């Protein structure tokens, strides 16, 4: 049964609620982004209207085979009417195609559902500037002050400089990057651009990337692994055993691997600066864990909420324990007392 924090009151709508069967009273299912915890339950047998971004709708049709007649893609930054209710989709600064949804209820209530997001000051000049929000359904993934990490631009500077140094010292080194979902494509695209290479990958991952409307993508990726010195592998294979095995497969073209695991936060964040990050090494294999996040840090989240000044906050992440819920409620009250709303 569908939890309350997936339901939009005063509408027929749900958000990211496909794993509960037919939800009573739901006339339109919204999907914020193509991550498995959120799409869980969708398939070619789904026969209700799904509302989403264009990129999300390319992935539903090509990867999950949802039939076209049930996909309703909406343009961003554009007022649209869905089943009698005005909605707007906004860029969430998460993975490709990810949105926040603004719902203008028939009684005058305005609701923002962030989906998954990485808050940014650029959001203070979107269509959110223009009116008051009564209720915020908030991605609280990293809602505690221990969660710090650098900007995405500092992380990509570290990765490019590390890869370019290694391959210029040893032209026979291979770079490997882990992946298990869409998102974080800048990691491997920026490294392949500094090296003058395409990114090589499996046919299944090439298919997924071809749904993303990334400009000039045919110039940047390939299924011909032999032609590429940046390879993408499943995240589970980014370990010494899995990398040794991959290096065997390349037929003596390479004699070293430098590998990247873009994680979110790890507790090495509480001690080490990006500048000071070092790899784990075994023989001719090195593995870097780099803190590339597509969710808000604590400080980014706090700034967004203190700017928006919502009347009520409903967390959508970390809701399953009483200790998490009480922690989060305490921070919300601090933020509201400090800012004065």
Tokens of 170: 């040893």
CB of 33 to Ni ion, least distance (A): 6
Query: Which residue's CB is nearer to Ni ion, number 95 or number 287?
Result: 95
**Range in contact with Ni ion (rule: CB under 5 A) among 48-56, 108-116, 143-151, 328-336:** 108-116
Distance CA 105, CA 115 (A): 18
**Residue 300 interacting with Ni ion (CB under 5 A):** no
Query: Which residue's CB is nearer to Ni ion, number 114 or number 162?
Result: 114
Task: Provide the residue count of the chain.
Answer: 341
Query: Which residue's CB is nearer to Ni ion, number 119 or number 174?
Result: 119
Q: Could you say which residues in the range 213-272 bind Ni ion, by CB under 5 A?
A: none
**Range in contact with Ni ion (rule: CB under 5 A) among 34-42, 48-56, 145-153, 332-340:** 34-42
Tokens of 239: 């370990």
- Residues with Cβ within 8 Å of 24's Cβ and at least 6 positions away in sequence, in order, are none
Separation of first and last alpha carbons in the chain: 35
**Residue 35 interacting with Ni ion (CB under 5 A):** yes
Query: Which residue's CB is nearer to Ni ion, number 142 or number 254?
Result: 142
CB of 181 to Ni ion, least distance (A): 8
Q: Could you say which residues in the range 130-159 bind Ni ion, by CB under 5 A?
A: none
Task: Identify any residues that bridge with 51 across adjacent strands, giving them in sequence order.
Answer: 30, 72
CB of 154 to Ni ion, least distance (A): 22
Query: Which residue's CB is nearer to Ni ion, number 116 or number 185?
Result: 116
Query: Which residue's CB is nearer to Ni ion, number 35 or number 246?
Result: 35
CB of 151 to Ni ion, least distance (A): 19
Query: Which residue's CB is nearer to Ni ion, number 176 or number 211?
Result: 211
**Range in contact with Ni ion (rule: CB under 5 A) among 115-123, 204-212, 213-221, 224-232:** 115-123
Residue from 46, 87, 116, 229 touching Ni ion (CB under 5 A): that is 116
CB of 116 to Ni ion, least distance (A): 4
**Range in contact with Ni ion (rule: CB under 5 A) among 27-35, 56-64, 222-230, 242-250:** 27-35
Closest CA to 148 of 277, 330, 291: 291
* Residue 15 φ/ψ, nearest 5 degrees: -130, 125
The 10 Å Cβ neighbour count of residue 155 is 22
Size of the site for Ni ion (CB under 5 A): 2
**Residue 118 interacting with Ni ion (CB under 5 A):** no
Q: Could you say which residues in the range 265-294 bind Ni ion, by CB under 5 A?
A: none
Query: Which residue's CB is nearer to Ni ion, number 170 or number 181?
Result: 181
CB 241 within 8 A of CB 259: no
Query: Which residue's CB is nearer to Ni ion, number 180 or number 341?
Result: 180
CB of 34 to Ni ion, least distance (A): 9
Which residues of the shown chain bind Ni ion in the complex (CB under 5 A)? 35, 116
């Amino acid at each position: 049964t569908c939890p309350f924090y997936k339901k939009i009151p005063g509408t027929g709508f749900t958000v990211d609620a496909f794993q509960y069967g037919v939800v009573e009273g739901c006339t339109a299912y919204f999907l914020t982004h193509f991550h498995s915890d959120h799409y869980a339950g969708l398939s070619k047998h789904f026969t209700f209207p799904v509302y989403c971004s264009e990129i999300t709708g390319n992935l539903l049709k090509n990867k999950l085979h949802v039939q076209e007649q049930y996909i309703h893609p909406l343009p961003l930054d554009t007022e649209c009417i869905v089943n009698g209710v005005k909605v707007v989709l906004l860029d969430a600064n998460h993975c490709p195609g990810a949105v926040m949804i603004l719902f203008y209820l028939p009684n005058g209530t305005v609701i923002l559902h962030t989906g998954d997001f990485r808050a940014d000051p650029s959001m203070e000049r979107s269509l959110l500037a223009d009116q008051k929000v009564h209720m915020l359904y908030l991605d609280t993934t990293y809602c505690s002050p221990e969660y710090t990490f650098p900007s995405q631009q500092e992380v990509i500077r570290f990765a490019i400089n590390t890869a370019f140094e290694a391959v210029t010292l040893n032209p026979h080194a291979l770079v490997v990057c882990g992946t298990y979902s869409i998102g974080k494509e800048k990691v491997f695209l920026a490294i392949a651009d500094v090296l003058g290479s395409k990114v090589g990958m499996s046919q299944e991952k090439y298919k997924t990337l071809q749904c993303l409307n990334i400009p000039e993508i045919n110039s940047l990726i390939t299924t011909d692994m032999c032609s590429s010195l940046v390879h993408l592998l499943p995240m589970m294979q980014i370990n010494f055993k899995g990398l040794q095995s991959h290096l065997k497969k390349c037929g003596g073209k390479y004699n070293q691997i430098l590998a990247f695991r873009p994680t979110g936060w790890t507790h090495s964040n509480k001690f080490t600066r990006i500048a000071d990050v070092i790899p784990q090494t075994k023989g001719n294999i090195s593995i870097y864990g780099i803190p590339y996040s597509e969710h808000s840090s604590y400080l980014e989240m706090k700034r967004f909420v203190q700017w928006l000044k919502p009347q009520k906050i409903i967390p959508t992440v970390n809701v399953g324990t009483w200790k998490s819920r009480s922690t989060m409620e305490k921070y919300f009250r601090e933020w509201k007392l400090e800012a004065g709303y």
